[PDB]
Amino acid sequence: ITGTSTVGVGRGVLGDQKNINTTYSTYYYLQDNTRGNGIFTYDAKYRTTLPGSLWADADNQFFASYDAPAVDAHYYAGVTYDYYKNVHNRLSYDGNNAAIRSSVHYSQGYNNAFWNGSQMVYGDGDGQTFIPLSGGIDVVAHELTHAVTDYTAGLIYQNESGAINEAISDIFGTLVEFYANKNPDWEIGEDVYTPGISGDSLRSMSDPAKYGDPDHYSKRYTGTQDNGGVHINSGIINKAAYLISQGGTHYGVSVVGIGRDKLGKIFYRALTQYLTPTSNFSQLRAAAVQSATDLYGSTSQEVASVKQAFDAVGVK
Ligand SMILES: [Ca+2]
Ligand SMILES: [Ca+2]
Ligand SMILES: [Ca+2]
Ligand SMILES: [Ca+2]
Ligand SMILES: [Zn+2]
Structure with a gap:
């Protein structure tokens, strides 16, 4: 969406506090305009329909338990974008600053994360085998790298x-x-x-x-x-x-x-x-x-x- 770039604060899956780039337009959205064509994080609301709804928050504070997976998916996608840009001089996964999209709260008790050819998807886990998958930086980077591979070696x-x-x-x-x-x-x-x-x-x-x-x-x-x-x-x-x-x-x-x-x-x-x-x-x-x-x-x-x-x- 079109709006004003700002910075919000929240807590991730592991309970750590971090600042996240958001966009303001009536609501505060998990849309980071500082990296390429943007990083967008969506709420799949326990359904399997993708991508779901762009994450909207009323006060730019993400400390609710339901917010945790979104905070980390958004933040770690940003860190991964930074890695590829600063270390390998690669702009996003396609090399041309393609927008990065992630959906969290996919399905119910879903113990998996994946790249569906167009975006990243994260389940919340069943609480026994896995906790929300976006809480792992190596998980997020693993998934975004699948996109890089698809656009390069294939x-x-x-x-x-x-x-x-x-x-x-x-x-x-x-x-x-x-x-x-x-x-x-x-x-x-x-x-x-x-x-x-x-x-x-x-x-x-x-x-x-x-x-x-x-x-x-x-x-x-x-x-x-x-x-x-x-x-x-x-x-x-x-x-x-x-x-x-x-x-x-x-x-x-x-x-x-x-x-x-x-x-x-x-x-x-x-x-x-x-x-x-x-x-x-x-x-x-x-x-x-x-x-x-x-x-x-x-x-x-x-x-x-x-x-x-x-x-x-x-x-x-
Ligand atoms: Ca809030
Ligand atoms: Ca363990
Ligand atoms: Ca590791
Ligand atoms: Ca580790
Ligand atoms: Zn894989």
């Missing part, structure tokens, strides 16, 4: 290309978590997963096997469930990414870590310049090696580390 969501698609979302979801410096780690979804259990997460990049996911190509899932195991085999790539950044010895192969910034630069270049819709793991390795070569030279430590990491997880 990795088909099935088998190996789908596992790469998933890993890319976990990798950048984690890099955004570090960017925001919000209790960063190499775990996925820890802030909104199982509120009654501390110390766990949905997936682990540092040790995928902790939750039963493969950490080597020889242990890859070859079945038909989960679109060919896109959320399972992503562990193989997540482990490789973790090794490239942090280093370590995996299955007898030693990798010298080069840091998170370089990891991000290498994978962003691979994603936007070399990957295609049908790329498999072997092609991802080639794309990563070529990207590191473009940026640091063929005889660099960076290229050596990328090769070592993929060797460690069995991807040739």
Whole structure:
């Protein structure tokens, strides 16, 4: 809507207070005009019809329990936009400042979040397995990254290309978590997963096997469930990414870590310049090696580390 840009205040899912960009026109709306063509957050009102209604508030104060998921979806979409713009010089998910839209309170007791090809959608969780999904910055960044992938490499969501698609979302979801410096780690979804259990997460990049996911190509899932195991085999790539950044010895192969910034630069270049819709793991390795070569030279430590990491997880 057309109005006056202002700043409101509210509390997120985890009870933390934060300032959010809003727009005033009779009501205060969750519309951030400071980033690209805008960030819009909608209320799905427990229904499945999208996008729902643009979030309207009477006093620009969002401290009600019902407001929490909206506050975080709105705020974290902004942080993710900032990451891509400041670190990779990318304007929104399409590279041309496309408006970012999110709907919260989708369905009832919905333990999922997703990108539907046009916008992000967040369930409130059932209170046991998950609490409102927008409360996790790595979750929000994971979802917005699916949009970035769709506009760039276009990795088909099935088998190996789908596992790469998933890993890319976990990798950048984690890099955004570090960017925001919000209790960063190499775990996925820890802030909104199982509120009654501390110390766990949905997936682990540092040790995928902790939750039963493969950490080597020889242990890859070859079945038909989960679109060919896109959320399972992503562990193989997540482990490789973790090794490239942090280093370590995996299955007898030693990798010298080069840091998170370089990891991000290498994978962003691979994603936007070399990957295609049908790329498999072997092609991802080639794309990563070529990207590191473009940026640091063929005889660099960076290229050596990328090769070592993929060797460690069995991807040739
Ligand atoms: Ca209010
Ligand atoms: Ca964390
Ligand atoms: Ca995390
Ligand atoms: Ca937990
Ligand atoms: Zn995903």
